[PDB]
Amino acid sequence: EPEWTYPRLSCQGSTFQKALLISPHRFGEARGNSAPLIIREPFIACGPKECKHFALTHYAAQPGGYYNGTREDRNKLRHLISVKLGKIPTVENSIFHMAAWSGSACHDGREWTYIGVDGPDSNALIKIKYGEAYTDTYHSYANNILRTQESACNCIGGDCYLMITDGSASGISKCRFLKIREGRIIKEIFPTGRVEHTEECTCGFASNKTIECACRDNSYTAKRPFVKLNVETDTAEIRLMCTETYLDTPRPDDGSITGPCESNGDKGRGGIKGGFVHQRMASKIGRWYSRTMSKTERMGMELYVRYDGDPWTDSDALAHSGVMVSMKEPGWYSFGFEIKDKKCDVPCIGIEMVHDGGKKTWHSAATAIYCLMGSGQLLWDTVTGVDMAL
Amino acid sequence: EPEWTYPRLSCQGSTFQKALLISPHRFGEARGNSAPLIIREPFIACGPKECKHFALTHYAAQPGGYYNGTREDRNKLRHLISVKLGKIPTVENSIFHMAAWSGSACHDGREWTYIGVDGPDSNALIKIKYGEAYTDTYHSYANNILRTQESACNCIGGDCYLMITDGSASGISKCRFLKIREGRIIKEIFPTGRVEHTEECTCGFASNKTIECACRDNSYTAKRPFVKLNVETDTAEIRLMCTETYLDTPRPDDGSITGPCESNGDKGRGGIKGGFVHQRMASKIGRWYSRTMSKTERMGMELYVRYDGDPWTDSDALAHSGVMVSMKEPGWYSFGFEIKDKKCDVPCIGIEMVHDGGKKTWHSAATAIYCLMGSGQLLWDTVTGVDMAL
Amino acid sequence: EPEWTYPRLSCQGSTFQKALLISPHRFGEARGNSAPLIIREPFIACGPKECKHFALTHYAAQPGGYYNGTREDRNKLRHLISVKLGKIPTVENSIFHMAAWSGSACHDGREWTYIGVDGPDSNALIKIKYGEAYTDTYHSYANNILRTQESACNCIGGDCYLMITDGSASGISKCRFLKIREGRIIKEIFPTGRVEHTEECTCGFASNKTIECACRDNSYTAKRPFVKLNVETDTAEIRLMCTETYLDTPRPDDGSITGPCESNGDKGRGGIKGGFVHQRMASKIGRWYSRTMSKTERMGMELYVRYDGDPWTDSDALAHSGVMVSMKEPGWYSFGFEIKDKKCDVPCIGIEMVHDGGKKTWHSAATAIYCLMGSGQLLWDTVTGVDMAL
Amino acid sequence: EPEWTYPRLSCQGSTFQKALLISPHRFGEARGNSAPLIIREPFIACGPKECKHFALTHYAAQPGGYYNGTREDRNKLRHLISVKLGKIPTVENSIFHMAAWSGSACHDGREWTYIGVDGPDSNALIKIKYGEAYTDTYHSYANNILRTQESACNCIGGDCYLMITDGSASGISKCRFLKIREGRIIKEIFPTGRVEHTEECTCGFASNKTIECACRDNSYTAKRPFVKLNVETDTAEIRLMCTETYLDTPRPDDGSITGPCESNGDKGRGGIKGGFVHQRMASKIGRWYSRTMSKTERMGMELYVRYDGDPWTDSDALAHSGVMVSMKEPGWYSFGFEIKDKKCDVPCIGIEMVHDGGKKTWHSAATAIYCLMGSGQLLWDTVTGVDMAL
Numbered sequence A, B, C, D: 001e002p003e004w005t006y007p008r009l010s011c012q013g014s015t016f017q018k019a020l021l022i023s024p025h026r027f028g029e030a031r032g033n034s035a036p037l038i039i040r041e042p043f044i045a046c047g048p049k050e051c052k053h054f055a056l057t058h059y060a061a062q063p064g065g066y067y068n069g070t071r072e073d074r075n076k077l078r079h080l081i082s083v084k085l086g087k088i089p090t091v092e093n094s095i096f097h098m099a100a101w102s103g104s105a106c107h108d109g110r111e112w113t114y115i116g117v118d119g120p121d122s123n124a125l126i127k128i129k130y131g132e133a134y135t136d137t138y139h140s141y142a143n144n145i146l147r148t149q150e151s152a153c154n155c156i157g158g159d160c161y162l163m164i165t166d167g168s169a170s171g172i173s174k175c176r177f178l179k180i181r182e183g184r185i186i187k188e189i190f191p192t193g194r195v196e197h198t199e200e201c202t203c204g205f206a207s208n209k210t211i212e213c214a215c216r217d218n219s220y221t222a223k224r225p226f227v228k229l230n231v232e233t234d235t236a237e238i239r240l241m242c243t244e245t246y247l248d249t250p251r252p253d254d255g256s257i258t259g260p261c262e263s264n265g266d267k268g269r270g271g272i273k274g275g276f277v278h279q280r281m282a283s284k285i286g287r288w289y290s291r292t293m294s295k296t297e298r299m300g301m302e303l304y305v306r307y308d309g310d311p312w313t314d315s316d317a318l319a320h321s322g323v324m325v326s327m328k329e330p331g332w333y334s335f336g337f338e339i340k341d342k343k344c345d346v347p348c349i350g351i352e353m354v355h356d357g358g359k360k361t362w363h364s365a366a367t368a369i370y371c372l373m374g375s376g377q378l379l380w381d382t383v384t385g386v387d388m389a390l
């Protein structure tokens, strides 16, 4: 058959550069003739030959008559959709995979696994699809909005790993990982460590032995929960990132959180999903991260890197590597993903750039992509170009 | 060349869950830019890799100018169309297969067979297409709206099997089954038993030896005619389902038809096509059924199951298995179908949810899908989200 | 490689039946959201696995602002376009093959040959394309609107044959045939016989040795020029059809043309392209033909057949085989084509049903298809369902 | 896996003829229902089976609300897009490859290489994509709008070759050539000779040993810089074309620049990218060129040819070969490209026909194609048919 995917060494390069903007609402004017779907939580996942751009639609287009409710996060209508990356996600270009108000997907080398959560808040349900077939489900364990990554899951040798979580958005949400093979859950992994609130993990392969994830703590801290999952033993441990460059939003000033690495610090309530991707070299690992320019608002997006070290213990500041989105522009969720070149993997970060005009109008998003590309420094930023009044 | 398809054991699971909603008129607003087709009698059929979503269109779109007459069932413009399941059935996404006002389709492992009926009411005509080619026809034998299933036909080792019927919607309509191989009728099967009125059969494989169908009696009863068709001898027998949980609409109260399993009972006149799909386990057979929540109107849809036994002799109540559509939402035709996973088949029930505003406006339908996945209880219902005034 | 196509015996059957209507302008209302292309001269040609529906577009859609000039036949904008048969020919569904105001195309088993004529009236040019590549041209020989079939060319063992003509529409237009192999003209065939005016031939295979064509005489007669082209010797002879059932429009009353078979008769000025297709049986050949219901106007369409005999000498009336389009509806150009089933060929006739509101509004066409299908008699007619005011 | 592509001898033919018009704004009327993209710098490149039609979009459609700024050349929204040749480039038909305000692409027999330039004017960046993956970048070396061909790059045995340039549009812009293999730059080529200003080179293979390019000098002359690049030694030399038929716009009268082939002459300032394609015969080489009909404005387009000789030393007038676009119609950039027939290559010239209404309205372009086919003289010209007021 095709063989299973494994993480490979990253393609050569040392800086990210602006790759691609998908801005569907550049075609959504009342006087235009297009039907871009109203979405949020976009992410990209790639198989050997193509990438798919996923998002959770509100099952409504612009221009249209169903803008009310598109700023809510969960309802009976939201669906996980995709287009081939490079296509504009319209009503006719998109594929509707399953009813879901939280999602993930990934390719294992042979087929696409799609993951969607729906159901009532107190009793939601993870549903897994392998290709066309619905293959398995997993139930709410803490009865308070069972939910998942909003970014790609990760497969090695046919085994795919997925973060799920359940619990209060302003209290305890202890995550678990599911190990999924051909669409069926073959193991539950219960993490150890600093486990009181971990959600929306952005995960990737640090090597063939370790998946690492930079997650969101929506309750207690502006430091990101950082997971290290050993794939050989199927065990996970979580501790907060110690870097003084706090990656959440909102957050206090860099380096202002006093005390040991594990200290929670101030301005911990609230959060945002954060970009994280690995650059695997023969003797060095680069960890690339994105955070908003604003410490309190979803505005702007800049890139940081650090090579080697241990995220759990290094207090050192990360190295600023370029402004991807200016302060002037929306910088909402961000995520990592890798494109498969012929012999090596290309690390990328994608940025959700939400068009927010409040509850009174439509609420949707463009997706900007920056990838590791050549050398030098990052040269240009992204704007959506959308005027929400048209 | 490809192997012929056979029924396989069903994938593991014990409950159905909400899978997917195709709601094309969420995009039909007069201020939007899309062209969802106006349709009724949707159904889905799957081949080894892909499923198609079929329906009978009135050859008109919303927004548009041809709404008048879209609440009629037969005319010279209706056509059988399909799209790949998960796509939206618009003017450009759809393929028009043949002129037809009653239809069916199925894949035999190698090619699609498409069936459509058209012609004048008193002398209509079954037409069969195998791939791109028109291959055969079957004539009216009762000269009173020759018609067929409005759901998937069923193929085993290249032989595909199809219910047709002809006769008065208010009296006698004896059905027949056609055995079709590579688009040509190779055998006609004349059933035995209770044959006074059988139409709109929803059929599936109980095993490699038997096809069973839950059908509609539009004239005499609210119990469903239940066909057992022996594929090895090509013989069929029909008797009424004996369960007190009457599956037709309209219907009397459950358990109220006194007398032997064959008693017709009250409120027999009228009917609806009903969902039915098999869960074939190694030692046992689950028969899954759907019926409207209202006893008299096409509103709501509930799921029921019974393991093993004989539908013709068992008076036992079917086990209520969850609300798919609440009573506030339309619940019109339902149908069963199976998705082919790698090693096993996934049973699903699809629900036609008609937007009915009467004859003064457009008349069309959303399709909701529920499939067997995981364990537990069915968790969430389906709404169309459509406002017919927009 | 794939092997070359040859005509095979026709699939079993004895009557035609309504197969499919493509009516693009059912979606062209000013308040709808679609873009059907404005076309005329549709025809269908099929390869082993699929059929393409071709037409000459005016490079304009409905609704739109370029309706002026769409009732003219030749200009700098007209293009040969196609869609897969079954798709609606819109701006986004269509492929634009080449600039052309007269066309033909056919598949040889390995690739599509597309043929288009354009250039000034006094000096037009046949251009041939094989797949994507432009491969050859042929020049005007009588300098007065060099033109071709408006229907499929015909390939046997890799050699494709095409009628072209040039000359006065109301005088002499002596046709020639080109023999084309992999897109290049390898022979010119100059017909013998009754050669003064032959245009718009509808041609098909009577056997592996003979192509026959029923053509239009726009100047001298209402009898159709009937070509017999011997494929083994590459010679052609033309004589008028002798049947008293005159197939052109306009025409006198059947059987009113006195004198020998070759007599021209009255009402010969004007003409229409006519449907003709072969049903090849082991010991018998059926010639199926279509003509308008009206003797003088492009209204209605009925089917006729005759088995065996010699068209050049049989004065006998053809047998009426059904009304495909009532007198009430447009019946403009018609054409034959064959769909390839697995082991046999299916003969079909397609009918151009032009929406004519005069020079003041848009002018375009729907395409109706009738194919040999089963037995009995033809049961239903086709309407476009279009209101030209919307 | 597939063989690498090499140039082959051209298909037989001695004249170019009108092939195809892609005029997307024939569908852009405010009362229509389509979304043609706003674009400039179209070009076409072909692989063994298919050609793509590329362009640089302003990420806006007609009808729409983002016309302001579509007459500017560089900004943060322009993207390189393509569709399959023959399709219309709308929002939904197109694929967005990468953010870019200057581009090129070519197929090497195995995969597509896509090149785009973006970044700030003083520090822009070549980015290269091979298939789906971003693989390499090249930095600005003169810090003054690094930019590239706006037409196909050229590959031979896996090595693809690309002109880039950087420097003042009013002064010195020394070009360089990049040798790219599987998306990565493996050699930089620094030309010799007359190097003061070369940009927008249109390049093709004169043979397996030499790539030649006719380029634009925006500063000093109306004669075109002509590159001869030796693929075996990877060296290049540039000298001005000596023909009296000056191919740039603006230009003085033909033959008016007195002095040796290197004299710059008058009206050197300004320029236009010009069409150029090779016809490689067994014993001889045809060089086909296009230039505007007006000497000063981008109006009309005429075809010229010269067989053999040396472009650097030959003062001879080129042979006028027909009017492709009359003086009444726009004639802006032109480019050469080759279509792969089964055994030989078909040379073609494409013409950008811009709809220019000034900065107060939309600014976009039709693409007209002429290719070598048959013998005789070029017969018909191309009009866009677009009314910019609709």
Ligand SMILES: CC(=O)N[C@H]1[C@H]([C@H](O)[C@H](O)CO)O[C@@](O)(C(=O)O)C[C@@H]1O
Binding pocket: A041, A073, A074, A101, A102, A145, A147, A148, A168, A169, A199, A200, A218, A271, A272
């Ligand atoms: C499943 C779900 O509701 N997810 C939502 C999450 C959660 O509210 C928080 O992660 C707290 O758990 O946050 C979003 O609100 C947000 O910040 O933009 C969007 C997302 O849809």
Ligand SMILES: CC(=O)N[C@H]1[C@H]([C@H](O)[C@H](O)CO)O[C@@](O)(C(=O)O)C[C@@H]1O
Binding pocket: B041, B073, B074, B101, B102, B145, B147, B148, B168, B169, B199, B200, B218, B271, B272
């Ligand atoms: C071929 C045909 O007309 N079928 C129609 C059937 C028949 O009327 C009944 O089955 C009685 O035979 O019922 C429908 O009316 C209905 O209940 O919604 C829809 C369907 O189109």
Ligand SMILES: CC(=O)N[C@H]1[C@H]([C@H](O)[C@H](O)CO)O[C@@](O)(C(=O)O)C[C@@H]1O
Binding pocket: C041, C073, C074, C101, C102, C145, C147, C148, C168, C169, C199, C200, C218, C271, C272
């Ligand atoms: C190439 C060309 O102009 N063809 C046109 C022909 C010729 O006028 C006649 O065949 C006489 O030669 O007739 C049509 O007019 C017609 O009757 O509907 C349509 C077609 O486009």
Ligand SMILES: CC(=O)N[C@H]1[C@H]([C@H](O)[C@H](O)CO)O[C@@](O)(C(=O)O)C[C@@H]1O
Binding pocket: D041, D073, D074, D101, D102, D145, D147, D148, D168, D169, D199, D200, D218, D271, D272
């Ligand atoms: C990268 C870039 O800006 N290219 C632009 C070039 C340059 O201005 C000139 O070649 C001088 O370098 O010219 C155009 O202006 C022109 O003449 O139509 C269009 C093109 O977009």
Ligand SMILES: *[C@@H]1O[C@H](CO)[C@@H](O)[C@H](O)[C@H]1NC(C)=O
Binding pocket: A006, A007, A008, A009, A207, A208, A280
């Ligand atoms: C991972 O393992 C596979 C073999 O199992 C190997 O080909 C690949 O290069 C390894 N990747 C890394 C990053 O070590």
Ligand SMILES: *[C@@H]1O[C@H](CO)[C@@H](O)[C@H](O)[C@H]1NC(C)=O
Binding pocket: B006, B007, B008, B009, B207, B208, B280
């Ligand atoms: C039906 O028969 C085929 C082989 O003929 C077998 O592979 C399949 O598993 C059988 N299905 C059932 C339900 O037993």
Ligand SMILES: *[C@@H]1O[C@H](CO)[C@@H](O)[C@H](O)[C@H]1NC(C)=O
Binding pocket: C006, C007, C008, C009, C207, C208, C280
């Ligand atoms: C035509 O010839 C081929 C072999 O050359 C044969 O297979 C085919 O059946 C023949 N068709 C007819 C109608 O005789």
Ligand SMILES: *[C@@H]1O[C@H](CO)[C@@H](O)[C@H](O)[C@H]1NC(C)=O
Binding pocket: D006, D007, D008, D009, D207, D208, D280
């Ligand atoms: C170029 O070389 C290839 C093999 O390397 C050959 O097949 C091809 O015909 C040559 N082309 C020309 C123009 O000579």
Ligand SMILES: [Ca+2]
Binding pocket: A216, A217, A218, A219, A220, A221, A222, A223, A248, A249, A250, A267, A268, A269, A270, A271, A272
């Ligand atoms: Ca936080």
Ligand SMILES: [Ca+2]
Binding pocket: A092, B092, C092, D092
């Ligand atoms: Ca579309």
Ligand SMILES: [Ca+2]
Binding pocket: B216, B217, B218, B219, B220, B221, B222, B223, B248, B249, B250, B267, B268, B269, B270, B271, B272
């Ligand atoms: Ca009933």
Ligand SMILES: [Ca+2]
Binding pocket: C216, C217, C218, C219, C220, C221, C222, C223, C248, C249, C250, C267, C268, C269, C270, C271, C272
């Ligand atoms: Ca005539």
Ligand SMILES: [Ca+2]
Binding pocket: D216, D217, D218, D219, D220, D221, D222, D223, D248, D249, D250, D267, D268, D269, D270, D271, D272
């Ligand atoms: Ca110049």
